[PDB]
């Protein structure tokens, strides 16, 4: 095994790891691809998402060229810290952990012409800015922008090693999304300018879509049953004042306690979501029942069935159905 040891020592002899390959003669390009092993959960509260990757970088180094009986030197992690590596950082990452259990999860393969490869396991928590105007029937484009930190456009450029449609691969079993679903990857390459200089940035857009299964059991369906609960109060004895009264006061309490959960789930945005508009219209249709009963009680030989009750037995459910057929079509179907 001493034949390979002297090859590694000859590669590392007189090697300055502080300098990029070809500092004053060429641009050190870096070929990049991402193997997404698990698209983790999207936390709406922090406007962030977690992604576990196999970030691979490949670049040409002319100092690491060896002549030996083995073409590819699959070396250990140690070798990685002793050679030059690009300082790729995520522009919108918040807190990302490079896993090192049990050994550091890194890879380093030096081919005989000097071409390198550097795979890494990361768990990136990146910023995904959300516009919750169409909550919960919305779709986002959560980005992931990486790029160099110290080296500008004239020093280090980035590129995809395969075709850009096939340079970000998502594993089939790797979907830890329980609320959303992944509709497809999307990449782009651009140049960003800051106070120091112009940098090459590579953007990976992940398209998402919220599934309406949690809120159609937690918010929409209990509010519809709350409105229907108030709708049966028009089929009650005109004389039964405490009964219709209790129906109304409780419906109003269930309506106001049901809204709490909505704002409890999403972040404190200034505007109003579409679920909040549904809450408001359901509140209007449940609070008009008390106004109707108060009018009947103000307007209450035996008593007769009120004409207001006979009109409200028909008008209120058809107005609720018309509102549902407007709202659900307008938001879900477009």
């Amino acid at each position: 095994t001493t034949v390979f040891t002297r090859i590694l020592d000859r590669l590392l002899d007189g090697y300055d790891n502080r300098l990029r390959p070809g500092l004053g003669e060429r641009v050190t390009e870096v070929k990049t691809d991402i193997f997404v092993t698990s698209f983790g959960p999207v936390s709406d509260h922090d406007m962030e998402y977690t992604i576990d990757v196999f970030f691979r970088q490949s670049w040409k180094d002319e100092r690491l060229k060896f002549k030996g009986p083995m073409t590819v030197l699959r070396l250990n992690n140690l070798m990685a810290s002793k050679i030059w590596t690009p300082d790729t950082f995520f522009h919108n990452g918040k807190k990302s952990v490079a896993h090192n259990m049990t050994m550091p999860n890194k890879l380093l393969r030096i081919t005989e012409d000097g071409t390198l490869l550097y795979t890494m396991r990361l768990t990136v928590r990146a910023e995904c800015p959300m516009h919750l105007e169409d909550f919960p029937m919305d779709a986002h484009a959560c980005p992931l922008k990486f790029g160099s930190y110290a080296y500008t456009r004239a020093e280090v450029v980035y590129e995809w090693t395969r075709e850009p449609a096939r340079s970000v691969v998502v594993a089939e079993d790797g979907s830890r999304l329980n609320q959303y679903d992944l509709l497809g990857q999307t990449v782009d390459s651009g140049i960003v300018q800051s106070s120091t200089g112009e940098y090459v940035v590579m953007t990976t857009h992940f398209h998402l879509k919220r599934k309406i299964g949690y809120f159609v059991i937690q918010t929409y369906l209990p509010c519809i049953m709350t409105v229907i609960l108030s709708q049966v109060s028009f089929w009650l004895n005109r004389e039964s004042v405490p009964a219709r009264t209790v129906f109304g006061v409780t419906t109003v309490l269930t309506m106001t306690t049901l809204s709490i959960s909505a704002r409890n789930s999403l972040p404190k945005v200034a505007y109003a979501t579409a679920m909040d508009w549904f809450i408001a219209v359901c509140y209007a249709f449940v609070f008009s029942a008390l106004i109707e009963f108060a009018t009947v009680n103000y307007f209450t030989t035996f008593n007769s069935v009120s004409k207001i009750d006979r009109l409200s037995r028909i008008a209120f459910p058809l107005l609720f159905g018309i509102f549902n057929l407007v709202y659900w079509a307008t938001y879900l179907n477009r």
Partner: antibody, heavy 116, light 105 residues
Framework: VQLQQSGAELVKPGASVKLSCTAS????????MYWVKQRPEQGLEWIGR????????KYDPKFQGKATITTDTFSNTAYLQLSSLTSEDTAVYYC???????????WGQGTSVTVS | NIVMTQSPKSMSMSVGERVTLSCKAS??????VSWYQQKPEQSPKLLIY???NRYTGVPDRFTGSGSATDFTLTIGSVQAEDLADYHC????????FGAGTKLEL
């Protein structure tokens, strides 16, 4: 920095022709090699892909089977194989080097094939 | 596949004014288009890469632009030696090409 191709060919239809272009000034192991078809008074049509470092090849679905791309390391050369030549295959071929941001940087002088 | 539908086939104007082109993509290609020129009896040469990046040796009069789907190439004060055919390509997927936009007097 210069891509030199072969000469013009004239063979009978139904035969096979060897077509080649030689790259100089660099190595083809770094960048991809792209083949393209230009029919006269028509647009360009991409033939296929080859990665000489890996040996992997990818082709258009309409050019699968009748065309394939081979390569070698020592001569630094890319090759074409054409089978079952017809009248619609009368065109001119270029080999294109993959450039910065996938842009088809360098082009050859062009080999015109003709059937009779 | 990715379909390039660049329009029109040819434009016939004089020397010294502004002429623009257009390249419409069927599916999303993100700033990965390329523009080439085609003289008669001449191999293509690269002009624009990315979306709007000027290649070395390209004059400043050739100004490109890019977006998610719509792409264009604007020529300012076209001269007599620029009378050639222009091709719009893409490389976000396996590469395709457009029909070809010519120029006339």
């Amino acid at each position: 920095v210069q891509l030199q191709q072969s000469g013009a060919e004239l063979v009978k239809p139904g035969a096979s022709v060897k077509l080649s272009c030689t790259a100089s000034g660099f190595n083809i192991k770094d960048t991809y090699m792209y083949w393209v078809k230009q029919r006269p008074e028509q647009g360009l049509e991409w033939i296929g892909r080859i990665d000489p470092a890996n040996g992997d090849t990818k082709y258009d679905p309409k050019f699968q089977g009748k065309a394939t791309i081979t390569t070698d390391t020592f001569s630094n050369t890319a090759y074409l194989q054409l089978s079952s030549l017809t009248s619609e295959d009368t065109a001119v071929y270029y080999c294109a080097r993959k450039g910065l941001r996938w842009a088809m940087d360098y082009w050859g002088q062009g080999t015109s094939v003709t059937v009779s | 596949n990715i379909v390039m539908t660049q329009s029109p086939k040819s434009m016939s104007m004089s020397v010294g004014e502004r002429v623009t082109l257009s390249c419409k993509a069927s599916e999303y290609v993100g700033t990965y288009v390329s523009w080439y020129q085609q003289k008669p009896e001449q191999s293509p040469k690269l002009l624009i890469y990315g979306a709007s990046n000027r290649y070395t040796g390209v004059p400043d009069r050739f100004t490109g632009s890019g977006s998610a789907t719509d792409f264009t190439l604007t020529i300012g004060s076209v001269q007599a030696e620029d009378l050639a055919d222009y091709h719009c390509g893409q490389s976000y997927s396996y590469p395709t090409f457009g029909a070809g936009t010519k120029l006339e007097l």
